[PDB]
Amino acid sequence: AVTINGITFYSPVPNQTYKYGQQLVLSIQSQPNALVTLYVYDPKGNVVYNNVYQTNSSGGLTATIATFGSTPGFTTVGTYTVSLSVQGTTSESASVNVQYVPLTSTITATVVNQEGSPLAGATVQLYNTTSGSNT
């Protein structure tokens, strides 16, 4: 486990890649009773998640932060800044440069005849009929 000292970050660790659908859970053994505003900035520098927590007597915070890949802003590729702004009397900071992966999909069309030889020249039109009209 990493620590930029004052925060025992059980997670995240610097330069970590989060997946499609994966949960950030903010597990940081830090100093009791402080105002821990985690700004989960996306790569455009706006707060797609933001919430102010407070570490308990043990010191562990447990909070599932973000559901990546299922919220706008956890859809955009590049370096997020997972920024703790720790407000006590004397404020402290943390900058964690974390990533995300993109996606796309692929479909197949196979043709065959009664002679068992794949035809060459059969046109196959693929429309997106989800809307209820041939997109």
């Binding site: 004052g6 025992t8 053994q29 830090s30």
Partner: protein, 102 residues
């Protein structure tokens, strides 16, 4: 019944330890700051429990079945595990490295 007890308080586990380092030299006292809170306080199944139950505070010779140490990753503990009468020593991810008879 458990009312007033011996060992009703609990130990202290200091942050700066009675530990020494090693690499090739045993000497030096490195900052032991056991990271970001020990959450404190040894707990113990009293050795002579049944009569300790009625002791307001007396001086016995206890056998201590937890010592609380919490740093990075997991938490370590040390204790003379009174149940099999065997000193259990553990790690900060926790495995019994030692069962030492009596």
């Amino acid at each position: 019944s458990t009312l007033s007890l011996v060992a009703k308080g609990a130990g202290v586990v200091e942050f700066l330890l009675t530990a020494y380092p090693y690499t090739g030299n045993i000497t030096f006292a490195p900052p032991w700051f056991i990271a970001e809170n020990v959450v404190k306080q040894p707990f113990m199944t009293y050795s002579d429990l049944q009569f300790a139950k009625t002791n307001p505070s007396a001086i016995l010779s206890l056998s201590t079945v937890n010592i609380t140490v919490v740093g990075l990753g997991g938490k370590a503990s040390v204790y003379y595990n009174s149940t099999s009468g065997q000193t259990v020593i553990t790690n900060i991810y926790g495995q019994t490295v030692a069962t030492l008879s009596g």
